[model samples]
Target: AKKVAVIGAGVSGLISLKCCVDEGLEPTCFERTEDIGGLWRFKENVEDGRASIYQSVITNTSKEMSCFSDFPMPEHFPNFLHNSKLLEYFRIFAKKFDLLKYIQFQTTVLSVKKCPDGQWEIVTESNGKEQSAVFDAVMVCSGHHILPHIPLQSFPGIERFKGQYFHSRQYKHPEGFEGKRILVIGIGNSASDIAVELSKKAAQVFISTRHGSWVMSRISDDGYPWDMVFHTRFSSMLRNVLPRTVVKWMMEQQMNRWFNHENYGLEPQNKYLMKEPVLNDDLPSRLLYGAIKVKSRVKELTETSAIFEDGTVEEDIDVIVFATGYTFSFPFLEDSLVKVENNMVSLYKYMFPPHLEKPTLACIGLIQPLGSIFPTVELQARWVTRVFKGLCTLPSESTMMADIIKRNEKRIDLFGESQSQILQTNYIDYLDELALEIGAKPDLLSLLLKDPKLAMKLYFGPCNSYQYRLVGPGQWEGARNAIFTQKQRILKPLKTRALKASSNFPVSFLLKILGLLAVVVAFFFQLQWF
Candidate 1:
């Protein structure tokens, strides 16, 4: 069996190990930390070269959409799980899959070199002792959240003004920050989350954004999760088939449907780009309560104030929290192996390095999907492991590089050239692309021929990890049933109270029918006018 070296026993590492085994490859994982659950695991103290998260960090994704392909979180778990609860789920998953045996905790990958034989040679240190090992392949799953990105040059007078300034990763809790007038710089997920959390105890909170973002809520129209409707195949189909301009307006309206972002001063600057919206239910409510004030770009920062581009100034800023995100870099590997310039890596499908002589190395879970990450990394591991086993072949180097450039251009057009959105990609489209590589993409036409109900569900229902498992190298018997009972599985823990006698009617069908009639009449009227 070909031995593979897996770096970091976090979510990506955990899934990578399992996938390698399922493909009949020998694998060993090296984690610097004593335990797993890299970013998901919360700790009281921040350690150097490790990921950190605030205590109040909760899963932005609903449990149903955020789970692995074969393993689901327990039915009793909350839909939006706290970091502590998510850590618990990871431990349970490790135990269930018996993945702990493959991991070497407290072992750090010191250096990774491509040997003369075209194999990977990884040197690791554990307990201050170093050792070298050779492997047929290496999976770089160490992660990107370690090095915090702080651009101090842009904030001109930040050096002079300093009551307390730090990155959001250092923020453990809201205890020491009570009654402080805080200025949070950024409107990303962490910014919104930290802003909303600190607004409770702070005297005032100011969120400064250079380019604003669309803020979305976890709750959907019918009190279900937002992703349940948002990530459906039908939703993706409309986005794919409709004209770009037509879709942009529809998306803009949907975003504003929750609350007029422009009225609240939270509208994204580039509203047409398919940027990932901030998922926070409390941000809008917090703004409504006057607990948070949205500000434009920070033109300058003085000793005790911030000047905005819109000619506004805020004073008495006792704390400055740069919720600016992290920089993506792998410190262990030689820079030449995977050159990262401004968060851009030339990887085929964001996994295999384009020009590598042998397809023996791949990076897992680096891309940022507009949806949950569990399924995102799962797809990468599934495809990468098979490639390592010679079950799939990567395209030629020229073709790969060409495709990378083409895809990156398309990504720039769709998501803008924002540094933070360098790795951003559409959720369903990315998943389907990877599934196609592994031959795991469900055959919709074949399903339609034999099982129309399943085919329609595949197209109309929530696009999920289970759909890929319906027919693939890693096929699971429970795939069909999992898709069938998704609603009950999602609502089991939510509908806690026993139902009494109640009558319900589908009022939406009336509007649904009316909408079809209205469309037909509009088209008929246009024909008559012509």
Candidate 2:
């Protein structure tokens, strides 16, 4: 059997390990930390090589939408989970699949070099001792959130400012900030999450943004999670089929349905541009309560103040949290394996290196879908493992490069030239593409001819992980039943105190009948009089 080496026992690595094993390949996983859950697991202090997240961090994506295809989160899990709750799920997942036996914990990969014979040579460090191994293929599951991306160069006079400031990675909790004025830069998920949490304890919190975001809440119509409604295939299809102008208008309307963004000064600069929106439930309320205030771009900084682009000066800024986002590095691997050319990402379908002699290496979860990444990375691992097992083949170098260029052209058309959106694709669109390659994508047209009930749900319901399992290489016999019971699982935790049925029945129904009869009789009387 061919041997596959997986890096970082995070979401991607665990799934990669499972896929390789299911495909009859020998796999070993390396995790730098002593535990799994990568960034999802919270650490109080910032670690250089590993991911760091602040306390009070909750999942933006709901449990049902973010879970693995085959496994549903336990029924008692909330619709949206906390960081620790999410880690508990991962822990259960690892044990259930028996993947921990294959993982080498506390071992960090110092170097990963592709050998002349087209194999991989991996050198790892554990307890200051070095070890080397050879593998048939390598899966780079090390995620893209390690490095802190602080654009201090862009913030003029930042060095002159005497206030304390650091990257968001160093932030642990909102304590010690009881009376200090805090300024949070950028309005991404991290920025908003930190700002909202700090708003309660800080003297005041100011969220600085160059281009503001359309703030969205987790709750949707009739109390379902937003993703459940937004990620439906029917909704995705409308966005694809409609004109760009019409769709942008529709998006603006939907995004603003919760509240008028313009009223709270949370509206994006170019609202029509399809950049990812910030998901924060309390931001608007925080703004309303005067705990958090939204500010435009910071043009310059003084010793104790910040000057906005529109010439508004905010004085006495005690601390600044640079939630500006991140850029990843892979020092162990060669440059060609991870090259970022002008527009082309240089990877074939964002996974395989187009220039390699053999497709023996794959990068999992090296993407930023505008949706939950669990299902996204699951499909990625599934496809990459299939390729590793020789069940799938990539295109030629010339063909792959051409496809990359074409993909970027469409990317710009949808997402503009924002660096934040450079790695984004429509969530379900990318998932379906990966599923199609593995012959796992559901055939709705064929299903409609055979089973219209299931077909209707496939088209109109949430474009979830269960839909992919309906047919393909990893077909689950219970996928149909699972899809049908989603509402039960989602509502189980919330409606614990269920209400009894009303004693009176059909009174409202009878009123409607009486109203329709009255309307008809009045119409006939008016006709006779005429």
Candidate 3:
């Protein structure tokens, strides 16, 4: 009869609620907005005549890569689903699970603190009424907001714009902007998508950026995504033999400077470092067709003109859309429990906190760039449930904290050039740890090395997400060497010969010998023949 309170009914919160209720736990969900689905929820932009989704818009990854494990996209839906469709899917998910009964709408959780009784005390305000309740456990699924951020500040002179100025959250459609000029700030997915989309209807579109990104197309019909094509199991072993500088150079050579663009005011520059470049297959095409134009940073905004970073100015712009990014902060939890720097948290192992063991909260969606979030989040949730049920236990708090510090140091090394660069964690391996912690699955080694199909998938698949099911912690078999060379690209951190030894391991021959020995022993012992 444990009572669990889940905040927000968005994808993350809903997923958590579904999993909790399925386990027979009493779960209550609180949503600040009247409707479910946080950012995925779509509405008209009141300020601008265009239709805009929640502020934190655009799918960084594809729709297929973002869906739940059990429920995939319907055949009709494209690889990247529209925001409206994504919202509809979430609504359907809630109805199918009968989650509305447990949900209290228009309710905001003011604070969540520990009570003297060792339970969570929840203070909430709903429709001008205040109330309090106590629950055995609380899941903070409020989700990353699309509005103001921590230490939140607005861009200067934005209020003085004669043209409609709005955040990406406030953009709606091409209704009133069919023939208007538009300027989009920030070079993230939202900016690119909006620039490409608006260039079609608006008289003109300008994309502005402060820092360049190592952009990649969503997919490649003939080849593969640059991230997967350049970094794969084939060259995984060579990475160890090469020096750090050599490896970085090699990586740059293999993937940099592949994009080509001209008409949209975009100039393809060094893909290895900064400067600015768009992916070839998707957004660049719209720009080439005279649909969108790209520009540098926005220095200052005026009534109808923008000052660019290159000491130039443009006039007659009708709209300026700020696609600035987001920040994260958990209000109820003490800052000491989690450290938020640069709008993101530095949780140990991207799961557990440094030393906080009070119910052991984990950051499930926090990724280091290498794996898909859909599978990762599901695996994380599964592990969280197992740990709660006493199926998993981590090392001592001191030891765990120490490990986290070490990981942060390693993270600095991995993302030396740019902390914002994509993450590269092995999803299967990460999930194995979670599964082991929860006693919900097998050890990592066993899951990966023991399964022929799973091993090959991790080694050779297309940005494969099957790794979380393989050699994770719970059902690990003693197959360290097998993973180093046979299944994964990254070899042992310390052992240079590990890869060669793993490659030469006589797995099939050993099986044959064991079978032969059994036959001989049975015959020698005068076993009765069938």
Candidate 4:
């Protein structure tokens, strides 16, 4: 039996272990912490080992777009879950799959080396004891959020003139910021969230950005999840047929209806489609109230002030929070084995390194998708396990390397060569790429003939991970039902007095009543029946 070594028991690691077990491989997983959930495991007190999440951190992506394929989040869970709820969901998943038995918790992987015989040697430490194991393959699921990227040196006079500066990872709560002036650097989701949260207690919050970004709310029309609006097949088709500029114009017009960014001094320098936008509702409102102010990139910092690139100066700034993102690193692997150049991961399909002797080592959950990481990483794990089990084979090394070069060049052309754009991927496009390889991409027309309702849901409703499992090697009998009832889960938490009639009645009951109403209307219209 092939022996596989899995690293980090977070969301990606847990799913990778499950995939290995299902493939009949002998696998053991090592987690540095005592429990799983990775960054989602919220701790009030930040520690050296755990990734710190803010107290009020909730998922940016909606639950429907973020769930695993076979296992759905509880129907009662909110459209967007808090970090605490996410930890509970991970626990439920680990228990259902009996995955804990295969995991060695509180274990740290010191290093991973490729054996001369084309195997893997992993050294791990736990409880002050070290052990080594050799395996046929290795999976790096250590995650990308551990290392905080603080560009203090890049800012002029930051070293000499600074009251206090720290990365957003060090930010725990807004308690200490009360009555203090704060400056948050970066335009990503974390920066916007931190700025909004601090605006509640801070004397004033200033957001600094080199190029601003499109800001969006978590909710869309009629209180539906924002992502659901664009998750339909029809939306995808429209984007394909329409001009790119036209589509972006339409999106900007819709967003402008919420709040005009130009008027608020929060407009992005880049086009809306060029980069991912900041998803926050309160930021614009905070801007409207004059609680949060926007500024250009910091040209220099004085002892107690900041000078902007636009010749504007802000005085008496107490704290600066760098919401700058984390750099991708694999400290466990030797530098000679794998290296990322210009922040671009040189992996074939962003999973396997092309220079590897064999397709035994794969990186899971290393992507930065516009949507949820859960389904994308799950797909990666599934593909890797199949390759390990000899059910699938990778391309030649030369071919893989060529493909990597082509993909990176295309990415540069589309999004530019900025460091942050390395791992960026469109959610649906990349999902379809992996799904085609695994035979999981559903045939909508075939489903229309066999199951019309399921086909309609697949096309019109929120496009979810469950659709991939409808007809594939890992096909699930519950997949169809999961898709059909997904809208109910989205609408259940939204019901108020506005939904008094439909809210109290069961969905099946409402469907039957509608059907009967249609029949009665048809009877009344027909003179032959009289």
Candidate 5:
């Protein structure tokens, strides 16, 4: 059997390992830490070690969208899971797939270099012991969350600032921050979450941003998951059919309906479509009640205050939390073989390097999907395994490079030339693109002709991972059943509500009656007595 080496034990690495096993390949995974769930593993204290999430961090994406294709998250799981729950889910996944035996915990990968015969030689260290191994293929899944990008040098007078400052990665919790003034830089999700959490303890909280961003809620106005409501085929079709300006105006209006962004001083300087919106519900409420204040980017910093670009000054800041995000790097790989320049990876389909002489290496989960990434990484792993197993072949080097350039150019056009935009991908579009190559993308028109009900659910319902598993190369028997009963899973929590509080009871009851009638009629027709 072919041999494969997977680096890291995060979501990407775990899925890559599973894909290898399914493809009948002998694989080994190297994890730098003692356990899995890379960033999802929460640490109680701030430390200069492996990356970890904050104490109160939760998933932005819902459980339905963020689960692996073959293994669904438990129906009891919340729509948005906490980091502890996320780590538990990962452990469950590992145990279910028997993936733990294949992983070497606490084994740090030092380097991965090309061998003379085009294979890969991986060097690792553990407990003062060093080891080396050769593998036919390598999958780099070491994630991009490490190496905090703190731009202290860019801010004037930062060197002389009196307050303690650190990146978001070093932040563990809001403890030891009571009665202190906090300034959090950046308008991303972490910045928003941290700002809101700290507001309760800190004397004052100020979120500083160069260009502001739209803050999105995890759920819709109608109480549906945001992604479930907006990321379907119907939504995509409407977006394609409508004029760009009209679509943008409609989105802006909807966003304003929730909160007048400009009134709250959080209106973005860039277009809404140009950058990923911050997903947080608490920040807006905090802003409204004066619990959290929004401020412009820092122009300079004094010993005890911050001077904003708009000439507004915040004085007596006790802590400066630089939620400034991260710069990605692969220290295990030689720069000549693979380099992430300005956070942009030169990879075909964001997985394979374009300049490699042999297609024996891939980088999985190096993307930032507009929705969930579990399905995205799973599909990517499937494609990579196919290439390694000789079931699919990549294009020529020039062709691959051309495609990379085209993709990068498109990203630049859509999101501008920001370093963070390098890994951006529209969730549905990217998933379909990958599925089309693996014969996993379902033919909706044909399905509509044969099974109209299933097609409607597949198209209009939530775009879950099970949809990809139905009628494809890696088809699963449970996918159809899972798709049919997905609504139950989504609304299971609401089942315990008493009838008095259900305002939409009449409509829900009517729909259920109609659904039962349709099922009965269809059942009779199947019996050949219609």
Candidate 6:
């Protein structure tokens, strides 16, 4: 029997457990906290680490984007599920799958070692008791969330502040924040969300941003979330041929047009610096209401005021929430097994940690992308389970590690340092790339070759988030050569005419004329079943 050990009973961990069971593996999960849902769970003083959630911690992604493709959220629920409903859903999912019995709550994985025999020896703590277990494969599903980033030391007197200052993580309620001056750092989803929520409760909330963000609406058509519109009935099929880069660029253009650069500090359109803010519709309404305000980057956080880079000042601020961002860390794995730089494990494709054997380890919910993380994680879980069951085997560790480093280097160069550290890579594209690396990539080159519009759309336009379906090596029979041939042919006018008209299109045209003539003939020969 394959005994799989999953660390962290959070969202990713639980999902990993479910996936493991589906793949016919016996999974034993350990969570330091008592419940699941990871960041979505709510509690006091860490009942299951639920205390980390803010008072109004609704999922930023729409239900359509955030939910697993196979198991969608119920229709009654809002696209963005409230924290409470999210927890309930998780519990229900767990109970439905009988996953609770497979889990050991309040159990923390202290360390894991790889025995020479290729099995994992895991040491964990539960109820003040420590125990060790050996398993065929170990999954570090301990969802990412270790540090809350705040550059306190950089600011001369931030620690010297005398008001109700706290990181976004510690911010639970806004009871005392009413009629108070607030300055929130960062412009990502969390920062924008907190600002929007605070604008409702606080007299005046000042959001300080180092850079401007391209905000999108969370809701789709008819107040539906963007995900619903993006992933409609045919969206998945469309995504297969739609190039993610093209879609990304097009969206960037649209957003830049809507929010004139002068309106905000965002960079010029098409510039390397222009970026989508981690926020969506959650913040703009507050700006319109004049309840919340935006300010340039903060230079210093003084005892009673926040100083901006322009040498300006805002005084009597009651609180400062560093919506800056959270930190990523792993406290269990041995340093030799993996690597850590500034907390983020230098993994390949954000799925597998390089230099480590392709063991049963996966990092889900770690990616932030224009698309959704749910599908990415689900596909990743599927691939991980497949590999664990010997359905797949990764390349040599050294070779894979080299590829990972080179890829990360290129990524850091193209997207800048923070992108390697921040910017969410579109999840769908990332998963496709991973599937290709693992020999399961699908053949999408045909679509690109056959249709210039579809080819450019997939390469340059952004339309579908389900393009991942056309990925994997097995799908690559019509490889790059085919793409080149087809594109070259389109460039040639003669070649274009040969393939432009489909048999159906010409046949339909002929059929229409034939039917009209037949109707005229029928006037003479009124032959019918009657």
**Candidate that would win on TM-score:** 2
Q: Tens-digit lDDT track for model 4 on 1-530? A: 38898899989998888778877788899989888888998888777655788899989888888889889888778988889998888999999989999889889999998788668889999899898889888888888877888888778888776578889888879888898999999887889899999998879999998778778898887878888776677677776578878877886787788888788777766563546678887898888888899999999998899999999999999899999877667777888556588756789888988887677898897888777889999889888898877788888888988998888886776565667678887777788788888888888888899988878878887789888888778778878888878878877776634644455565644456787888888877568755
Give the candidates in order of lDDT, highest first. 2, 1, 5, 4, 6, 3
Per-residue CA lDDT of model 5 for 162-266, tens digit only, reads: 989988888777888998999999986989999999997779999998778888898794787888887898787776578766777877886787899999998
- Regions of model 3 farther than 4 Å from truth: 22-24, 45-64, 74-77, 95-100, 149-162, 223-258, 261-281, 300-303, 332-336, 341-346, 350-357, 360-371, 412-454, 462-530
Give the Cα error of residue 350 in candidate 3, in Å.
4.1
Q: What's each prediction's clash count?
A: 0, 0, 27, 0, 0, 24
For model 4, which pairs clash? none
Per-residue lDDT of 1-530 in model 6, one digit per residue for the tens? 38988877777777778878877899998877766777777664433223377767776665534555335454456556678887776787788778899878878888887777558789988797798989888766655444677777756778778987777777677676777888888776777777777778787888776656567676544554565455432354444456656655655675664455446544433334323345466566677688877888888877898888878899988888887777665667776555656423466556666566545555656665556666567666767877777887777778777776676565554344562255345445565665554544434467656666546545543323233434442232333333333323223332234546676566544557777888888788566858
Q: Please tell me which predicted candidate would have the highest lDDT against the true structure.
A: 2
What is the Cα root-mean-square deviation between model 2 and the actual structure? Answer: 4.3
Residue 153 lDDT, candidate 4, scale 0-100: 78
TM-score of 1: 0.94
Q: What is the C-alpha lDDT of each candidate?
A: 0.86, 0.87, 0.59, 0.83, 0.84, 0.64
| TM-score, cand. 3 vs. native | 0.72
**Residue 414's lDDT in candidate 2:** 83
lDDT of 3 by residue, 292-405 (tens): 767777887778888888888889998887776444566667677667554234565666665565653565555544444555666666666555555556677778767766
Off by over 4 Å in 1: 502-530
Clashing pairs in 5: none
Distance from true location, Cα of 4 in model 1, Å: 0.9
The alpha-carbon root-mean-square deviation between model 6 and the true structure, to one decimal in Å, is 11.3
lDDT of candidate 1 over 1-530, digit per residue (tens): 28899999889999888888888888999999989999888889999768888888878887878888888778888888989999899899889888899889888898998889669889999898799999999998888888888888888899789688999878888888899999998987889999999998889999999788888888896888888789998898888799987998998899898899999997777777888889998999999999999999889989998889999999989999998988778778878767656546678877888879889999897889988888889999998888888888898998998998888888888888877887899899999998999999997988899999899988888877788889878788878888888788778888888846533554343445687878888776455554
> After superposition, which runs of candidate 4 have C-alpha atoms over 4 Å from their true positions?
496-530
Candidate structures ordered by TM-score, highest first:
2, 1, 5, 4, 6, 3
